[PDB]
C-alpha cells in the first residue's frame, strides 16, 4: 500500500496472508469469508508468465495478523490448505480477467477479536454501493512505494468512473473489473502495490453497517502513479462461481 497508514488492531479481522513455507515469506493478500474459505486473486497462485504455479502443499494461510514479519503468538492463526480452486476462465494470458480464487482450509479457523469473516455483496448492495466516488478501503502488507512496512497498512480509495479507468491504460478492461484511486487533480493519492494482490477491497454498508468485500486487489501499472488506477476483481459478478464452489466442495 502506498500513502496509507497503519491499521488499527482489529480493523481488518478478515485480512489473510498467503505465506510461503520455503522460503518463508509474504506471497499475497487474501480474505476470510468463512471459517473454512479464504478468497484471493487467481494470479497469486497461478501466473505462468513468471513461472508461478503454487499448489496447496506449497502454502500456509495466516489469519489475525497485524505484524508483517513477526509470528504473532496467541493472536494469529496459520492454516494448511485443503484445496485450491481457480476460476476456469481466469485470463492470465491477456488482462487478468476473472482474477479470483478460493482456498478451502484443512480445519476451520477459530474466530476471535482478531479473526472474523467479511460479507460478500448481494446484487442490491453491489448495485447500491459500487458507484463512482463511493469510497472503499484496501488493506495489505505490500510495498509502501514503487516498501515493506512493519504492520498492516490501510488506505481508503474512491471508485473511479469506467471511462476514466479505460482511458488510463492500454489494457482491455472488462465488466469483471473496476478501478479505484484519486485523480491527479484531487490532491490525495494512494494505491495498492506489490504484495497487496489478493487482498480485499472493502466498503461499509450504511444500510446495515456491515463490511462487504466488493473487490479483490488485481492489477496496476506501477504503484500510485498519477493517471494510473488500481484495478480490482469485481466480486459480485463472479459470485455464482463462488457459491457454486462452496455449495458442493463444502
Amino acid at each position: 500500500i502506498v500513502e496509507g497508514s497503519d491499521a488499527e488492531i482489529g480493523m481488518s479481522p478478515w485480512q489473510v496472508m498467503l505465506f510461503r513455507k520455503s522460503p518463508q515469506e509474504l506471497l499475497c493478500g487474501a480474505s476470510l469469508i468463512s471459517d473454512r474459505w479464504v478468497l484471493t486473486a487467481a494470479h497469486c497462485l497461478l501466473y505462468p508468465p513468471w513461472d508461478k504455479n503454487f499448489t496447496e502443499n506449497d502454502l500456509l494461510v495466516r489469519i489475525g495478523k497485524h505484524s508483517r514479519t513477526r509470528y504473532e503468538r496467541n493472536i494469529e492463526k496459520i492454516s494448511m490448505l485443503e484445496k485450491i480452486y481457480i476460476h476456469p476462465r481466469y485470463n492470465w494470458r491477456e488482462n487478468l480477467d476473472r482474477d479470483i480464487a478460493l482456498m478451502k482450509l484443512k480445519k476451520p479457523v477459530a474466530f476471535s477479536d482478531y479473526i472474523h469473516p467479511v460479507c460478500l455483496p448481494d446484487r442490491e448492495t453491489a448495485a447500491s454501493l459500487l458507484q463512482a466516488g463511493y469510497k472503499g478501503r484496501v488493506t495489505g502488507w505490500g510495498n509502501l512505494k514503487e516498501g515493506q512496512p512493519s504492520v498492516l497498512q490501510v488506505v481508503n480509495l474512491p471508485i473511479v468512473e469506467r471511462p476514466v479507468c479505460k482511458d488510463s491504460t492500454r489494457i482491455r478492461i472488462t465488466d469483471n473489473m473496476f478501478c479505484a484511486g484519486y485523480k491527479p487533480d484531487e490532491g490525495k493519492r494512494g494505491d495498492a502495490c506489490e504484495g497487496d494482490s489478493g487482498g480485499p477491497f472493502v466498503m461499509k454498508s450504511p444500510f446495515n453497517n456491515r463490511w462487504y468485500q466488493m473487490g479483490i486487489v488485481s492489477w496496476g501499472e506501477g504503484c500510485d502513479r498519477d493517471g494510473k488506477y488500481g484495478f480490482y476483481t469485481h466480486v459480485f459478478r463472479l459470485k455464482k462461481w463462488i457459491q457454486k464452489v462452496i455449495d458442493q466442495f463444502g
Binding site: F19, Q24, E25, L60, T69, Y71, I78, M80
Partner: peptide, 9 residues
C-alpha cells in the same frame, strides 16, 4: 526477514 513460524506448521 520474517520471524520463523512455529516448526509444527
Amino acid at each position: 526477514d520474517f520471524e520463523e513460524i512455529p516448526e509444527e506448521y
